Design an enzyme around this catalytic site. Structure first.
Site, PDB file in Angstrom:
ATOM      1  N   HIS B 351      60.144  30.742  42.126  1.00 61.48           N
ATOM      2  CA  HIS B 351      59.595  31.989  41.358  1.00 61.48           C
ATOM      3  C   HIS B 351      59.562  33.115  42.321  1.00 61.48           C
ATOM      4  O   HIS B 351      59.090  34.222  42.131  1.00 61.48           O
ATOM      5  CB  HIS B 351      58.211  31.620  41.041  1.00 61.48           C
ATOM      6  CG  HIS B 351      58.007  30.762  39.736  1.00 61.48           C
ATOM      7  ND1 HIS B 351      58.053  31.032  38.661  1.00 61.48           N
ATOM      8  CD2 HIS B 351      57.774  29.344  39.900  1.00 61.48           C
ATOM      9  CE1 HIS B 351      58.010  30.004  37.815  1.00 61.48           C
ATOM     10  NE2 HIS B 351      57.914  28.847  38.531  1.00 61.48           N
ATOM     11  N   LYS B 542      50.238  44.895  36.363  1.00 65.84           N
ATOM     12  CA  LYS B 542      50.912  43.835  37.166  1.00 65.84           C
ATOM     13  C   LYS B 542      49.784  44.027  38.389  1.00 65.84           C
ATOM     14  O   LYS B 542      49.606  44.872  38.838  1.00 65.84           O
ATOM     15  CB  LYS B 542      52.439  44.154  37.515  1.00 65.84           C
ATOM     16  CG  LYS B 542      52.946  45.386  38.169  1.00 65.84           C
ATOM     17  CD  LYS B 542      54.360  45.720  38.058  1.00 65.84           C
ATOM     18  CE  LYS B 542      54.673  46.182  36.894  1.00 65.84           C
ATOM     19  NZ  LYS B 542      55.644  45.090  36.426  1.00 65.84           N
ATOM     20  N   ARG B 543      49.899  42.561  39.099  1.00 74.20           N
ATOM     21  CA  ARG B 543      49.491  42.852  40.491  1.00 74.20           C
ATOM     22  C   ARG B 543      49.871  43.934  41.373  1.00 74.20           C
ATOM     23  O   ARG B 543      51.088  44.098  41.198  1.00 74.20           O
ATOM     24  CB  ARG B 543      49.609  41.327  40.957  1.00 74.20           C
ATOM     25  CG  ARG B 543      48.709  40.127  40.344  1.00 74.20           C
ATOM     26  CD  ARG B 543      47.196  40.258  40.516  1.00 74.20           C
ATOM     27  NE  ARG B 543      46.844  40.095  41.811  1.00 74.20           N
ATOM     28  CZ  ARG B 543      46.564  39.070  42.341  1.00 74.20           C
ATOM     29  NH1 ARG B 543      46.492  37.900  41.814  1.00 74.20           N
ATOM     30  NH2 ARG B 543      46.049  39.001  43.567  1.00 74.20           N
ATOM     31  N   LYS B 548      56.583  45.803  44.076  1.00 77.45           N
ATOM     32  CA  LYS B 548      56.538  46.556  42.710  1.00 77.45           C
ATOM     33  C   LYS B 548      56.309  47.981  42.504  1.00 77.45           C
ATOM     34  O   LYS B 548      56.563  48.407  41.355  1.00 77.45           O
ATOM     35  CB  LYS B 548      55.225  45.680  41.921  1.00 77.45           C
ATOM     36  CG  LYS B 548      55.351  44.178  41.739  1.00 77.45           C
ATOM     37  CD  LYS B 548      54.019  43.535  41.402  1.00 77.45           C
ATOM     38  CE  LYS B 548      54.100  42.136  41.220  1.00 77.45           C
ATOM     39  NZ  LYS B 548      54.794  41.666  40.006  1.00 77.45           N
ATOM     40  N   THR B 650      57.577  39.308  33.531  1.00 73.60           N
ATOM     41  CA  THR B 650      57.365  38.887  32.122  1.00 73.60           C
ATOM     42  C   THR B 650      56.471  39.797  31.235  1.00 73.60           C
ATOM     43  O   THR B 650      56.715  39.870  29.977  1.00 73.60           O
ATOM     44  CB  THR B 650      56.711  37.473  32.238  1.00 73.60           C
ATOM     45  OG1 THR B 650      55.520  37.662  33.031  1.00 73.60           O
ATOM     46  CG2 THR B 650      57.486  36.366  32.598  1.00 73.60           C
ATOM     47  N   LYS B 654      56.876  41.422  27.515  1.00 77.14           N
ATOM     48  CA  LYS B 654      55.794  41.772  26.522  1.00 77.14           C
ATOM     49  C   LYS B 654      55.838  43.407  25.775  1.00 77.14           C
ATOM     50  O   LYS B 654      55.694  43.245  24.699  1.00 77.14           O
ATOM     51  CB  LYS B 654      54.356  41.782  27.027  1.00 77.14           C
ATOM     52  CG  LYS B 654      54.241  40.013  27.641  1.00 77.14           C
ATOM     53  CD  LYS B 654      52.881  40.240  28.794  1.00 77.14           C
ATOM     54  CE  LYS B 654      53.048  38.870  29.678  1.00 77.14           C
ATOM     55  NZ  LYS B 654      52.013  38.977  30.364  1.00 77.14           N
TER      56      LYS B 654
HETATM   57  O1  LIG Z   1      53.888  34.719  40.762  1.00 76.77           O
HETATM   58  C1  LIG Z   1      54.864  34.651  41.418  1.00 76.77           C
HETATM   59  N1  LIG Z   1      56.269  34.701  41.106  1.00 76.77           N
HETATM   60  C2  LIG Z   1      56.356  35.298  40.064  1.00 76.77           C
HETATM   61  O2  LIG Z   1      56.699  34.295  38.841  1.00 76.77           O
HETATM   62  C3  LIG Z   1      57.020  34.928  37.600  1.00 76.77           C
HETATM   63  C4  LIG Z   1      57.289  33.773  36.626  1.00 76.77           C
HETATM   64  O3  LIG Z   1      58.416  33.248  36.874  1.00 76.77           O
HETATM   65  C5  LIG Z   1      58.256  35.951  37.786  1.00 76.77           C
HETATM   66  O4  LIG Z   1      58.450  36.610  36.483  1.00 76.77           O
HETATM   67  C6  LIG Z   1      57.970  36.985  38.651  1.00 76.77           C
HETATM   68  O5  LIG Z   1      59.221  37.647  38.985  1.00 76.77           O
HETATM   69  C7  LIG Z   1      57.792  36.352  40.145  1.00 76.77           C
HETATM   70  O6  LIG Z   1      57.035  37.433  41.272  1.00 76.77           O
HETATM   71  C8  LIG Z   1      54.601  33.747  42.779  1.00 76.77           C
HETATM   72  C9  LIG Z   1      55.598  33.009  43.639  1.00 76.77           C
HETATM   73  C10 LIG Z   1      55.346  32.091  44.587  1.00 76.77           C
HETATM   74  C11 LIG Z   1      54.058  31.763  45.090  1.00 76.77           C
HETATM   75  C12 LIG Z   1      52.956  32.521  44.404  1.00 76.77           C
HETATM   76  C13 LIG Z   1      51.692  32.255  44.812  1.00 76.77           C
HETATM   77  C14 LIG Z   1      51.329  31.931  46.204  1.00 76.77           C
HETATM   78  C15 LIG Z   1      49.974  31.842  46.383  1.00 76.77           C
HETATM   79  C16 LIG Z   1      48.980  31.915  45.488  1.00 76.77           C
HETATM   80  F1  LIG Z   1      47.655  31.444  46.102  1.00 76.77           F
HETATM   81  C17 LIG Z   1      49.285  32.151  44.358  1.00 76.77           C
HETATM   82  C18 LIG Z   1      50.648  32.347  43.828  1.00 76.77           C
HETATM   83  C19 LIG Z   1      53.253  33.342  43.316  1.00 76.77           C
HETATM   84  C1  LIG Z   2      51.992  38.926  31.871  1.00 81.75           C
HETATM   85  C2  LIG Z   2      50.946  39.062  32.852  1.00 81.75           C
HETATM   86  C3  LIG Z   2      51.341  39.377  34.272  1.00 81.75           C
HETATM   87  C4  LIG Z   2      52.767  39.319  34.514  1.00 81.75           C
HETATM   88  O1  LIG Z   2      53.175  40.601  34.794  1.00 81.75           O
HETATM   89  P1  LIG Z   2      54.609  41.157  35.621  1.00 81.75           P
HETATM   90  O2  LIG Z   2      54.696  42.733  34.890  1.00 81.75           O
HETATM   91  O3  LIG Z   2      55.939  40.349  35.208  1.00 81.75           O
HETATM   92  O4  LIG Z   2      53.967  40.955  37.279  1.00 81.75           O
HETATM   93  C5  LIG Z   2      50.248  39.480  34.938  1.00 81.75           C
HETATM   94  N1  LIG Z   2      49.107  39.455  34.620  1.00 81.75           N
HETATM   95  C6  LIG Z   2      48.818  39.488  33.372  1.00 81.75           C
HETATM   96  C7  LIG Z   2      47.297  39.506  32.926  1.00 81.75           C
HETATM   97  C8  LIG Z   2      49.699  39.160  32.316  1.00 81.75           C
HETATM   98  O5  LIG Z   2      49.641  39.168  31.050  1.00 81.75           O
END
Ligand SMILES: O=C(N[C@@H]1O[C@H](CO)[C@@H](O)[C@H](O)[C@H]1O)c1cccc(-c2ccc(F)cc2)c1
Ligand SMILES: *Cc1c(COP(=O)(O)O)cnc(C)c1O
Ligand SMILES: O=C(N[C@@H]1O[C@H](CO)[C@@H](O)[C@H](O)[C@H]1O)c1cccc(-c2ccc(F)cc2)c1
Ligand SMILES: *Cc1c(COP(=O)(O)O)cnc(C)c1O
Lengths: 810, 810
Positions: B351, B542-543, B548, B650, B654
């Site tokens: 991811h 988004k976060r 980003k 994602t 949406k």
């Molecule tokens: O969230 C992630 N990666 C994201 O995954 C989504 C779904 O495939 C993608 O759409 C998006 O482009 C991508 O950024 C992602 C990937 C690796 C690790 C972590 C993580 C690490 C420590 C934590 F404590 C909690 C989470 C989050």
């Molecule tokens: C869909 C969704 C995300 C993922 O959004 P990205 O634009 O792909 O980072 C994050 N947080 C919430 C609450 C969502 O519904």
């Protein structure tokens, strides 16, 4: 099956079955293929709980409309045990539920056995709270039990190599179907901070907040459709609590530790901060809840006409300075008017005279944790000592003795003195105990305010302690004199006209034999050990304390053993000696006594010369639900405390109700029990209170009894030499050494008269017909010891409310 | 009311009302006089849950009888949000429940708003797990979601002085009606100990036991009567845990801290012991549960025909050495046969490519905590590097690069390398991401085993993300092309034949205006602030991460502001810029960006020359249920990550589904979205991946853009001089300094092309009819981005199971 268990109507049984299947499906999300007996217990528990809620809502509504005076029973302890069978009894659902489960192919008695005890108590004090709640519902009083929902109740006791092991009572692991969380009635409790003085009076600031979230449990009255509420607080951190990030969330545990565990130190005081936090937590949340209910009826003159607060010992004594704090600091009443209200609202029940049980909180603790209550306490002390000085001018010693503040290296607050000062009524729990309170530890307080001191002799609910645990006895009594006695136990006196009835004598003896067969079987199934059910069942069940003198019982047991080994071919009345109870985890001596009991068992139970003539069983994990089993099966109740040490006792009453005779000292309610049955129907022995004082004045020299009683010398030599501990020959030197040099409780002083009295018990047991007639005279005079009598006396002489026996509508 | 919300039959409405009153009375123990909206929400939640349980039991039974191959989705994250409205949609109960509540005098929409989000996730990864679970139920797969029941989910974000404050998400305070505790399926998990080698192989001994207690939550499929299960483990101490006495009971918290809190560090790796404990805990309990189900159908050759295990990133990578441990140490299979089974069972989804997100656990940690898994990992590494050596003889560099064990001061295990080694399939989450995986970070692994690497472009469930959050849009689409598209989103392509229909153009534009009025109103009611609903709704949710490029958005906002102040009397297309998202609590730069956004708002929103022409809103506490509100109300979706950094995204999908146009880089799924809509129906701008590499080779000198773009020089001078922070003139020097000297993500490189592209957006917005026609072309081509397409591709190309659209019987 049997009349006292109620009707099993076609319609009731059909509805219970239908609602059982609805809960199994909707609530437990199981079908009959995957369901365990635990699922079946929960489906039945939810089904019976549904019969409570209509009456619960209706009762709470009725109190809102009639606005009667309300009784708040404040205790750190509610030893409730199991709820399912109690609920069925008081709703008259037992026969219907038994029929309904039978038709679904289940045994209700196997389902009842899956329920965990609500073990939110140590012993007598917590169980008295439970009996009281049942009695207060049965007598139609508008009463609330207020406590702490401990996550872990009294530890589960395992024996390992004859030693007590403690494990955590995780009673909530599977859920509590009886409780309803009320997160919406959540209240803040404050700790620490400091006091600012303004123009607008004192202000408690920079405090730590802990949230108190209430859990309501129904308390059904006996067949009157009244359902009162036991409200238990649980500690929750606020959501900004600590708020790097992870540790802040984990550090929320610190605040929630307040409601985590019951202190298991029965009849002993440890001045730990965490205990004081538990005491203030239940008091702070409870008083806000009380004051909010009172305002939903400005003027606090009517507070005492609307509120009674009963203090179960000193544990919730902070209710007094807290009521003052709310009324003075928050409601802006002047001191004198607030004090008038506080005294008229509060009443204090003392439950011991042992000085190591009295709460004396260090001042440095109250100064850190509750700085404002320490101020209010000093103010109360000052005004109180001005009344003493004026009453008894020049008596500077009385001033020192009566102070709420003790001098010493550590200054302490005497919480008992605070309760007497701040209460309109102080009571003991048996007539001899209430007399000792006035003669000795509160003599000075009695002389100042004689009007405050009362007696309220303890009682037990005949619902749990006869109908529930001993249905066969309840039924044969009901065949003769009807059912009314279950809520009017004085009616048992009508049984004296059946003392010479061959049929009733046979029935009483047959119920006892049935209970003994059933209990003997329960010892095989659950704990793999073989007992002769024709033997006399000699049982001592209560917490392990030196003052309760399990060691005196041990000395008798080793005597019976030594007599058999000396004359093996002489007849003796066979006995099973059962001793059971928990030791406080840090009470070394209590732990050694448990180990001595198992050590006696290992010698006696495997001597082939002894045979089935003598058995010593240590009953593991003694708790409410084990008491419901062993007390119906007892022939002899052991109540052998040193005179002046058992404030009342309540086990004693349970056993009298259930067809055991009593070997006991003139201590606690034992005096009133012998007085009610006649002394000739009681195995009384040993020093009276006055004899113990005569011994104290000249000095207790135990060596004198060792020197004069060869039978006793032999036992002490066996203990010393390692007769009972061949691997560690000196395992019991602490016990020998305590008995010879440091015995506060005079075990040797009572030995001769105890063994002699035990000989008269064996003599009477040889004559079954006369034994059973003596039992009839005990059961028939046990009426006074119903907690309905006790509560009716609190109601009339302390609370100023009139008990009612009227049904509420269904 | 509207067709897609289902029938409201006379009989259904009557039963829902009757069962609502039954739950209000029996379950919540309230009457209508004392009930709060919260009680009403719970009564409705229990009423809707009762419709799930028949189907839940039936579905679980059907899987037992058909014994199909089972999909286990292992994730540390399930960002589920609210359950009530989703459940109503998938059971077709929404109109009946709305009617039933209306007739009882309640507004269902006010009751829906009382439900807490299940916030058991950070962002994209946790939400993809949730969409997947819905899609797996909707496509009839025998799928289990397996995770941790965290006591606290993602922190609640408060802004204070424009700064993010974190408070604890206590989502369980009031209870979770959707979950069923299954304490009877409790499993031990082991930690620490050490390894003994015997004759009988290796033995893991002297371990600490933590209990894993499962909680089952239903996952209803869309109108097919399928209800799958999300099983979340919760940590409990054993009852002998520690077992002076009090501290032992309090120290039980230590073991239960494992399931206490979600780590909030999105797309960043912290090697904390507690995180590794969370990873092993979910893996150990889940694999025993899997193996127990498999044995209730000796021989593990059929294990991979019966079990698929999908790994949501490396978080549950320990599933690989744990399966080896169970199969080798406990089941006594030889290594090679166990490895065959493990590889054929397991599949890995990557991811991210950001190197600071990759899990590299120190060896000293795994050695202390999981000594046997460290042994199994070394063994896997050795045999794996023997395959590399044999494939590429002499390439000693490839051996070093491909090792599972990294050298350094601290040796580390590369958990990504472990997953590729131990998995039959490795996938990325968008076509460009999967290509980068093969070109760059896993090039060496691709060359060894090209067969493993696949793409599965991400998707979103059109149930939550259209029917649920945007009913007006779902209905006008259903007026034209029926309802079938909700479970077959490719059918939206039929809307292209309505691109020139004046009625459909008017309806699309009216739904958008309605959603904007409704959202504008929600900003007044809940957060007291006034926005022009005729303005263009420019939203970036988004976060908060540097990659980003919220800062690029900030730079555009300050540009629009500076242009207005220079020519105040010139017309501009009015905009509301909404930016929202959480910062990881220790991510300083992310916190400064939130503070810059609020600082821009304080200047812009209170300039009288600006008027209602430009507003900057920071949307507080962005979460799933806020996304359901703001995404339907958006005109412009901001997807402006540096090319090569957003694995997929994602949110982008949406917003395309809900009638916003997209300004974005050629990054992640943005490429496929433009490809599906045509590039002419997309606001594409900035560097491609290949352009970013050209800049890296010669060096990114940000000073060059500062020197050449006067508009950009002005913004950096405003930031520096304290234009946006008059009290602390140097508050933003960290941001300026990062942008000028240390910008990993080339914000200046994309500034010119971004501002130009933003001019073309404003131009098109001036022509409403052409804007709405471009929106129709986006909605109509968003079919590919349904998670039903995604899961059908996992099912066919990875799991070897055939999706089904057949109803189960009711
Ligand atoms: O969230 C992630 N990666 C994201 O995954 C989504 C779904 O495939 C993608 O759409 C998006 O482009 C991508 O950024 C992602 C990937 C690796 C690790 C972590 C993580 C690490 C420590 C934590 F404590 C909690 C989470 C989050
Ligand atoms: C869909 C969704 C995300 C993922 O959004 P990205 O634009 O792909 O980072 C994050 N947080 C919430 C609450 C969502 O519904
Ligand atoms: O239990 C008690 N006292 C007992 O009360 C019952 C009921 O009135 C009497 O029958 C009996 O004679 C008497 O011994 C009692 C009395 C004071 C304090 C405590 C106590 C202290 C610390 C704790 F952590 C827990 C409990 C218990
Ligand atoms: C009644 C009861 C007690 C009190 O017994 P005493 O003999 O008065 O100490 C203690 N524990 C249990 C379980 C009880 O039921």
């Amino acid at each position: 099956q049997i009349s006292v268990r109620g009707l099993a109507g076609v319609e009731n049984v059909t509805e219970l079955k239908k609602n059982f299947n609805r809960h199994l499906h909707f609530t437990l999300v199981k079908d009959r293929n995957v369901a365990t007996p635990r699922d079946y217990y929960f489906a039945l528990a939810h089904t019976v709980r549904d019969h409570l809620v209509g009456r619960w809502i209706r009762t709470q509504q009725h109190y809102y409309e009639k606005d009667p005076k309300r009784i708040y029973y404040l205790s750190l302890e509610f030893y409730m045990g199991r709820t399912l069978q109690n609920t069925m009894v008081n709703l008259a659902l037992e026969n219907a539920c038994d029929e309904a489960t039978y038709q679904l192919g289940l045994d209700m008695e196997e389902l009842e056995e899956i329920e965990e005890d609500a073990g939110l108590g140590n012993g007598g004090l917590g169980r008295l709270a439970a009996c009281f709640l049942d009695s207060m519902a049965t007598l139609g009083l508008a009463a609330y039990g207020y406590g702490i929902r401990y996550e872990f109740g009294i530890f589960n006791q395992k024996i390992c190599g004859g030693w007590q092991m403690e494990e955590a009572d995780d009673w909530l692991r599977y859920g509590n179907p009886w409780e309803k969380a009320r997160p919406e009635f959540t209240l803040p409790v404050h700790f620490y901070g400091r006091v600012e003085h303004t123009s607008q009076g004192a202000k408690w600031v920079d405090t730590q907040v802990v949230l108190a979230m209430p859990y309501d449990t129904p308390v059904p009255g006996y067949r009157n459709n009244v359902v009162n509420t036991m409200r238990l607080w649980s500690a929750k951190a606020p959501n900004d609590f600590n708020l790097g990030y992870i540790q802040a969330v984990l550090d929320r545990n610190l605040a929630e530790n307040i409601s985590r565990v019951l202190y298991p130190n029965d009849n002993f005081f440890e001045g730990k901060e965490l205990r004081l936090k538990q005491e203030y937590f239940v008091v702070a949340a409870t008083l806000q809840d009380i004051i909010r209910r009172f305002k939903s009826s400005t003027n606090f003159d009517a507070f005492p006409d609307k509120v009674a607060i009963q203090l179960n010992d000193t544990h919730p004594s902070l209710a007094i300075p807290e009521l003052m704090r709310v009324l003075v600091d928050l409601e802006r009443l002047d001191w004198d008017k607030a004090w008038e209200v506080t005294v008229k609202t509060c009443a204090y029940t003392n439950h011991t005279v042992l000085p190591e049980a009295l709460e004396r909180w260090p001042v440095h603790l109250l100064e850190t944790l509750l700085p404002r209550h320490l101020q209010i306490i000093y103010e109360i002390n000052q005004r109180f000592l001005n009344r003493v000085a004026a009453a008894f001018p020049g008596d500077v010693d009385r001033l020192r003795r009566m102070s709420l503040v003790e001098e010493g290296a550590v200054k302490r607050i005497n919480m008992a003195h605070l309760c007497i000062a701040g209460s309109h009524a102080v009571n003991g729990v048996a007539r001899i105990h209430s007399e000792i309170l006035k003669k000795t530890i509160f003599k000075d307080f009695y002389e100042l305010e004689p009007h405050k001191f009362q007696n309220k002799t303890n009682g037990i609910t005949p619902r749990r302690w006869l109908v529930l645990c001993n249905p066969g006895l309840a039924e044969i009594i009901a065949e003769r004199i009807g059912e009314e006695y279950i809520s009017d136990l004085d009616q048992l006196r009508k049984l004296l006209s059946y003392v010479d009835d061959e049929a009733f004598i046979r029935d009483v003896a047959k119920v006892k034999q049935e209970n003994k067969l059933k209990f003997a079987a329960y010892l095989e199934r659950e704990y793999k050990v073989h007992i002769n059910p024709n033997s006399l069942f000699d049982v001592q069940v209560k917490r392990i304390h030196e003052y309760k003198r399990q060691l005196l019982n041990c000395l008798h047991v080793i005597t019976l053993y030594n007599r058999i080994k000396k004359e093996p071919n002489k007849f003796v009345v066979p006995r099973t000696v059962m001793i059971g109870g928990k030791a406080a985890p840090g009470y070394h001596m209590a732990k050694m006594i448990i180990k001595l009991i198992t050590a006696i068992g290992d010698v006696v139970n495997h001597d082939p010369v002894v045979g089935d003539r003598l058995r010593v069983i240590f009953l593991e994990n003694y708790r409410v639900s084990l008491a419901e089993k062993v007390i119906p099966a007892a022939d002899l109740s052991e109540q052998i405390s040193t005179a002046g040490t058992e404030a009342s006792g309540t086990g004693n009453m349970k056993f009298m109700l259930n067809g055991a005779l009593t070997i006991g000292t003139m201590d606690g309610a034992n005096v009133e029990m012998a007085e009610e049955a006649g002394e000739e129907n009681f195995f009384i022995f040993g020093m009276r209170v006055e004899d113990v004082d005569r011994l104290d004045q000249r000095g207790y020299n135990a060596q004198e009894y060792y020197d004069r009683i060869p039978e006793l010398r032999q036992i002490i030599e066996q203990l010393s030499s390692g007769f009972f501990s061949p691997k560690q020959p000196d395992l019991f030197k602490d016990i020998v050494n305590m008995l010879m040099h440091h015995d506060r409780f005079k075990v040797f002083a009572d030995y001769e008269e105890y063994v002699k009295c035990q000989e008269r018990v064996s003599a009477l047991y040889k004559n079954p017909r006369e034994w059973t007639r003596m039992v009839i005279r005990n059961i028939a005079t046990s009426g006074k010891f119903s907690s309905d009598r006790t509560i009716a006396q609190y109601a009339r002489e302390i609370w100023g409310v009139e008990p009612s026996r009227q049904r509420l509508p269904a």
